[PDB]
RNA sequence: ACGGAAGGGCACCACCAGGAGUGGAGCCUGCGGCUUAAUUUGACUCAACACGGGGAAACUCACCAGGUCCAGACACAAUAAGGAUUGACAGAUUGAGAGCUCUUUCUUGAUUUUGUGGGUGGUGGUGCAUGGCCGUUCUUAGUUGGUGGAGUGAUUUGUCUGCUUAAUUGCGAUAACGAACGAGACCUUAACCUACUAAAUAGUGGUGCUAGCAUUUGCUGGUUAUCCACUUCUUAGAGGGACUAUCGGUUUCAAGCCGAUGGAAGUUUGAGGCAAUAACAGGUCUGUGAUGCCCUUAGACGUUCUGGGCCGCACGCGCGCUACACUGACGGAGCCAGCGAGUCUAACCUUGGCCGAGAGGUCUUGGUAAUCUUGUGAAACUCCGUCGUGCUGGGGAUAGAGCAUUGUAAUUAUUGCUCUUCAACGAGGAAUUCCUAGUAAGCGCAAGUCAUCAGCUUGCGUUGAUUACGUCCCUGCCCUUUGUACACACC
């Protein structure tokens, strides 16, 4: 005598684009296997964090610059799950490197 | 929470650096060879990768109690918010950092530069690595700084395979008369990759043909 | 070092690595305080440890 | 100015050396042949490898050539 | 380094409780977190106890890390007349 | 290795053909010089001079004039519970509401002091002691090992006359045969998907609900979900796609090259990323709690506090910004991007409503962000006018007077606005820079910096050429040959 509706939004952010994407779809139908309808993987544009800095520690030699990059990927999924699977896909959902964030209803 | 996640991602990226530095410093005597923390809103889990773990834990876990208790207070993690466990590193002679520190403690014990350097190279080779290389820079009893290279096997240096198969690690060993620079280069066996490509793009292996019998004028059987 | 005694150094390094993996392979088959600190004060909190008085003249 | 590397050239001769029954004079057919007959690591790489074998096999039907 | 014995007993006893202590390399702080004294009073109080061999120090990005030693334990063990095996910061909490 | 010899090459950091220019002038900025109490310092051909991310009001800060503090760990000794040592009200003193010092006399209680020894820090020195990093040879093509041939040997052949390539990239010739690093591969980014997976944080069609003009049903909007469908646009996952393909021309008809067609694309597809061996007394001890040694360390080269300086001005050099106008300045009006950023113990990005000529002020809200700031309505540019060739309304130095903003502090004027003042400059000597396609050049934008301060830089898109499609003449560098008594290698 449990399992009411959820109105959940699971927005996952991470830098590893193969470890976040395997657990991204690892749950794409780990809910459809239990036949839950859903709006699947939403892919916000990747984030490019750039750092332009001179290579020399001093200010000698040719003025050579160097741009560094860090790319971020955040994917949100809206679910249709129960009130006891809240903590089912919470622990083996992970792979070191993927920040998991589960949200609540639209208000 | 409470912040933007780009700031958050760079924030814990800085966090990994601060940690790895502190570890390479406090316990280097145990062949520490890197760490990594796992994202889990359960606990926080960092795993030490040294070569002598029993020394990392101490008397009935007394010293890891100390070590864990320290990283806790820097970021003031409520007691229980984090704990670390010591995991020995598999075949340390493939990950550069392990061998880099190895020579540091070898030269620091009075071994001949050539002898100690050559030892880790033959060790790293018989330890599995496809290739190896080590450079020693600085001064050794001679006011003029020299530099000797010691390498064995195969070693690629251009493109992406570099980021994939080569593990580098530099270490400044602070001696009596100067600061010697130790650089290590280990080439992991590509075929034995186990994660990702397993051969440099140069490798193009063709599977050879087999038996070509004569015409053997038409025949056909039924079933 | 010098190239004249290298051989005795190269083989000593060869013999060196021999010992390093010998221990490596050898370490594969090898083999309180009934008091407290934060509660020692919560236990030793007994009285008869001070005497207050003030405000004379 | 794109002379193919001898890495691909060395490979092209080594396959025409043992696969003339196969290896039709068309690139596309030869291209899908390498994914199954070779262990190349990239599209682009095998593309010039197969694209070269074609030119070699296109000339063998004219006369012989070194290798 | 001059400091009232009361402010020294605060930090002195804090070490026996936790066994380890951290401090940021920032004088002019005027007070330590987890302690009731000036950060300045703490750092070279520790480095003094360090020069005696009772505690090991490290810097690692401008935060001081101090670990009490197997020999200094007895030193402060007789600063409040602690009993043999009273407490190290060495007791597994429940089953750790 | 080098040569002040000879033969072959490659390149817009070299010319050819041209473009846009600096050099001339005003200011900005750095470097010299000079001046100064100080005007802190590194660096001086390419490879110093908008470089130290170096846009310095305090800080920064290293300099100068002055004031504080020990944060002199640890060890022995001395002093010392009759007190080792600590602190301050007011007062004199002081930039100072610093008990610095002094007067007076309470205080603190073994934490200091004194001496020595030993440390500790310093942007003190030494980069000609080092690490590490970085800069240069290098808009390069070089390095090496197996078997074999030569040589007593160090060695050489491999690793080559020619031809082709960006490439020791191949062809071909070949006592060499077959390989590895480096080049290629590779990786990233920008270009192709009506084929796959679908998304109110992206968007399209219908439909509700809804508004204007025309009516004849239409045309143009509103609508945080009113519903319904979709993935072309958007996004980012997985694939595919190109391999110089086809045909032809050229050529040992070899590697290759060139023309045409096809093609998203046919200049290494464009742009990057990475990058072997060696070499430098290249720069960096002023990034480092990287460091050897030396210096100093209590009247300090430690450290902080107050103020000044790095901006100081007869001049010399260099990177720039704005111009000399009519392919214009101005005024209305049309009015289109892209790379970014952005507020928790918080003051970041800011829409919107008012007040204000402006600057700005003020009242609220969205936003930790594809969600709000933002379609960043940017600028050149397009349009319609006023101006008329005259330093003119081009030009905007200098300068006065006022109002704002940043900030503890704006004087030597941080920045913004307003009025007024209206310089030189009428296309720049000798000289020299960058560059071949969405490039040059014009244009503004974000980001770094940042409380305030871009004439700087790093990225971005916006409008968009000329003339090349070649050579070794200039210059530079490679490669042979060659001489060498140099090998610490022509310093
Ligand atoms: Mg490459
Ligand atoms: Mg396969
Ligand atoms: Mg040419
Ligand atoms: Mg040319
Ligand atoms: Mg010309
Ligand atoms: Mg000219
Ligand atoms: Mg003071
Ligand atoms: Mg002393
Ligand atoms: Mg002394
Ligand atoms: Mg220093
Ligand atoms: Mg000097
Ligand atoms: Mg040097
Ligand atoms: Mg150096
Ligand atoms: Mg060029
Ligand atoms: Mg012989
Ligand atoms: Mg030769
Ligand atoms: Mg699509
Ligand atoms: Mg065409
Ligand atoms: Mg020098
Ligand atoms: Mg340095
Ligand atoms: Mg000052
Ligand atoms: Mg200056
Ligand atoms: Mg310049
Ligand atoms: Mg106009
Ligand atoms: Mg007014
Ligand atoms: Mg809010
Ligand atoms: Mg005029
Ligand atoms: Mg004007
Ligand atoms: Mg002109
Ligand atoms: Mg700015
Ligand atoms: Mg700058
Ligand atoms: Mg000779
Ligand atoms: Mg000379």
Swiss-Prot record, chain A:
This is Small ribosomal subunit protein uS10. Component of the small ribosomal subunit (SSU). Mature yeast ribosomes consist of a small (40S) and a large (60S) subunit. The 40S small subunit contains 1 molecule of ribosomal RNA (18S rRNA) and 33 different proteins (encoded by 57 genes). The large 60S subunit contains 3 rRNA molecules (25S, 5.8S and 5S rRNA) and 46 different proteins (encoded by 81 genes). Belongs to the universal ribosomal protein uS10 family. The gene is RPS20. It is found in: Cytoplasm. There is a cross-link at residues 7, 18, 87 (Glycyl lysine isopeptide (Lys-Gly) (interchain with G-Cter in ubiquitin)). One of its GO terms (cellular component) is cytosol. Component of the ribosome, a large ribonucleoprotein complex responsible for the synthesis of proteins in the cell. The small ribosomal subunit (SSU) binds messenger RNAs (mRNAs) and translates the encoded message by selecting cognate aminoacyl-transfer RNA (tRNA) molecules. The large subunit (LSU) contains the ribosomal catalytic site termed the peptidyl transferase center (PTC), which catalyzes the formation of peptide bonds, thereby polymerizing the amino acids delivered by tRNAs into a polypeptide chain.
Curated annotation (Swiss-Prot), chain B:
Residues 19-90 form the KH type-2 domain. GO terms for cellular component: 90S preribosome; cytoplasm; cytosol; cytosolic small ribosomal subunit; nucleus; preribosome, small subunit precursor. PROSITE patterns: KH_TYPE_2, RIBOSOMAL_S3. GO terms for molecular function: DNA-(apurinic or apyrimidinic site) endonuclease activity; RNA binding; structural constituent of ribosome. InterPro entries: KH_dom-like_a/b, KH_dom_type_2, KH_sf_prok-type, Ribosomal_S3_C_sf, Ribosomal_uS3_C, Ribosomal_uS3_CS, Ribosomal_uS3_euk/arc. Ubiquitinated at Lys-210 in response to stalled ribosomes. Ubiquitination leads to activation of the No-Go Decay (NGD) pathway and degradation of non-functional 18S rRNA: first monoubiquitinated at Lys-210 by MAG2, followed by formation of 'Lys-63'-linked polyubiquitin chains on monoubiquitin by HEL2 and RSP5. One of its GO terms (biological process) is ribosomal subunit export from nucleus. It holds the Pfam family KH_2. Disulfide bonds: none annotated. There is a cross-link at residues 104, 130, 139, 149, 198, 210 (Glycyl lysine isopeptide (Lys-Gly) (interchain with G-Cter in ubiquitin)). The modification Phosphothreonine is found at residues 42, 68. The keyword Metal-binding does not apply. Component of the small ribosomal subunit (SSU). Mature yeast ribosomes consist of a small (40S) and a large (60S) subunit. The 40S small subunit contains 1 molecule of ribosomal RNA (18S rRNA) and 33 different proteins (encoded by 57 genes). The large 60S subunit contains 3 rRNA molecules (25S, 5.8S and 5S rRNA) and 46 different proteins (encoded by 81 genes). Belongs to the universal ribosomal protein uS3 family. PANTHER family: 30S/40S RIBOSOMAL PROTEIN S3, SMALL RIBOSOMAL SUBUNIT PROTEIN US3.
UniProtKB/Swiss-Prot annotation, chain D:
It comes from the Eukaryota. This is Small ribosomal subunit protein eS17B. Present with 30500 molecules/cell in log phase SD medium. Component of the ribosome, a large ribonucleoprotein complex responsible for the synthesis of proteins in the cell. The small ribosomal subunit (SSU) binds messenger RNAs (mRNAs) and translates the encoded message by selecting cognate aminoacyl-transfer RNA (tRNA) molecules. The large subunit (LSU) contains the ribosomal catalytic site termed the peptidyl transferase center (PTC), which catalyzes the formation of peptide bonds, thereby polymerizing the amino acids delivered by tRNAs into a polypeptide chain. Component of the small ribosomal subunit (SSU). Mature yeast ribosomes consist of a small (40S) and a large (60S) subunit. The 40S small subunit contains 1 molecule of ribosomal RNA (18S rRNA) and 33 different proteins (encoded by 57 genes). The large 60S subunit contains 3 rRNA molecules (25S, 5.8S and 5S rRNA) and 46 different proteins (encoded by 81 genes). It is found in: Cytoplasm. Belongs to the eukaryotic ribosomal protein eS17 family.
From Swiss-Prot, chain E:
Transmembrane segments: none annotated. The N-terminus is not modified. InterPro entries: Plectin_eS10_N, Ribosomal_eS10, WH-like_DNA-bd_sf, WH_DNA-bd_sf. Keywords: Cytoplasm, Ribonucleoprotein, Ribosomal protein. Pfam families: S10_plectin. Signal peptide: none annotated. The keyword Transport does not apply. It is found in: Cytoplasm. It comes from the Eukaryota. Its main location: cytoplasm. GO terms for cellular component: cytosol; cytosolic small ribosomal subunit. GO terms for biological process: cellular response to amino acid starvation; cytoplasmic translation; positive regulation of protein kinase activity; ribosomal subunit export from nucleus. Coiled coil: none annotated. GO terms for molecular function: RNA binding; structural constituent of ribosome. Component of the small ribosomal subunit (SSU). Mature yeast ribosomes consist of a small (40S) and a large (60S) subunit. The 40S small subunit contains 1 molecule of ribosomal RNA (18S rRNA) and 33 different proteins (encoded by 57 genes). The large 60S subunit contains 3 rRNA molecules (25S, 5.8S and 5S rRNA) and 46 different proteins (encoded by 81 genes). eS10 interacts with GCN1 (via middle region); this interaction is direct and promotes GCN2 kinase activity. Belongs to the eukaryotic ribosomal protein eS10 family. Present with 54100 molecules/cell in log phase SD medium. This is Small ribosomal subunit protein eS10A.
């Amino acid at each position: 005598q449990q399992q009411q509706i959820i109105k959940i939004r699971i927005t996952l952010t991470s830098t590893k684009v193969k470890q976040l994407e395997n657990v991204s779809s690892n749950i794409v139908k780990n809910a459809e296997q239990h036949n839950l309808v859903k709006k699947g993987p939403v892919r916000l544009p990747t984030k490019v964090l750039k750092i332009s800095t001179r290579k020399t520690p001093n200010g000698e030699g040719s003025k050579t610059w160097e741009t560094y990059e860090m790319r971020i990927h955040k994917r949100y999924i809206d679910l249709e799950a129960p009130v006891q699977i809240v903590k089912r896909i919470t622990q083996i959902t992970i792979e070191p490197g993927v920040d998991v964030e589960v949200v609540v209803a639209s208000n | 929470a409470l912040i933007s996640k780009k700031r958050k991602l760079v924030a814990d990226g800085v966090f990994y650096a601060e940690l790895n530095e502190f570890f390479t410093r406090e316990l280097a005597e145990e062949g520490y060879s890197g760490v990594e923390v796992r994202v889990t809103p359960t606990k926080t889990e960092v795993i030490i990768r040294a070569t002598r773990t029993q020394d990392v834990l101490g008397e009935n876990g007394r010293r890891i109690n100390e070590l864990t208790l320290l990283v806790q207070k820097r970021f003031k993690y409520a007691p229980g918010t984090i704990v670390l466990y010591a995991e020995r590193v598999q075949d340390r002679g493939l990950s550069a950092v392990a061998q880099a520190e190895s020579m540091k403690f070898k030269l620091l014990n009075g071994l001949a530069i050539r002898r100690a350097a050559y030892g880790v190279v033959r060790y790293v080779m018989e330890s599995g690595a496809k290739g190896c290389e080590v450079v020693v820079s600085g001064k050794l009893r001679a006011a003029r700084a020299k530099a000797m290279k010691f390498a064995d096997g195969f070693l690629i240096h251009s493109g992406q395979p570099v980021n994939d198969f080569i593990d580098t690690a530099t270490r400044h060993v602070l001696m009596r008369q100067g600061v010697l620079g130790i650089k290590v280069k280990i080439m992991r066996d590509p075929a034995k990759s186990r994660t990702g490509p397993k051969a440099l793009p140069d490798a193009v292996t063709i599977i050879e043909p087999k038996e070509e019998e004569p015409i053997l004028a038409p025949s056909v059987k039924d079933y | 070092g010098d190239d004249k005694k290298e051989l005795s150094a190269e083989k000593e390094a060869q013999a060196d690595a021999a010992a390093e993996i010998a221990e490596d392979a050898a370490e594969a088959e090898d083999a309180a305080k009934k008091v407290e600190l934060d509660a020692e004060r919560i236990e030793t909190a007994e009285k008869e440890a001070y005497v207050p008085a003030t405000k004379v003249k | 100015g794109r002379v193919r590397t001898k890495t691909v050239k060395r490979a092209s001769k080594a396959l025409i050396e043992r696969y003339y029954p196969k290896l039709t004079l068309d690139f596309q057919t030869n291209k899908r042949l390498c994914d199954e007959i070779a262990t190349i690591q990239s599209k682009r790489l095998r593309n010039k490898i197969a694209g070269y074998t074609t030119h070699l096999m296109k000339r063998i039907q004219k006369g012989p050539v070194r290798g | 380094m001059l400091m009232p014995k009361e402010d020294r007993n605060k930090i002195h006893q804090y070490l026996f409780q936790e066994g380890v202590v951290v401090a940021k390399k920032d004088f002019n702080q005027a007070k330590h977190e987890e302690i009731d004294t000036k950060n300045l009073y703490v750092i070279k109080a520790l480095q003094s106890l360090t020069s005696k061999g009772y505690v090991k120090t490290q810097f690692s990005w401008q935060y001081y890390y101090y670990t009490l030693t197997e020999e200094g334990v007895e030193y402060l063990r007789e600063y409040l007349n602690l009993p043999e095996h009273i407490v190290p910061g060495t007791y597994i909490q429940e089953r750790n």
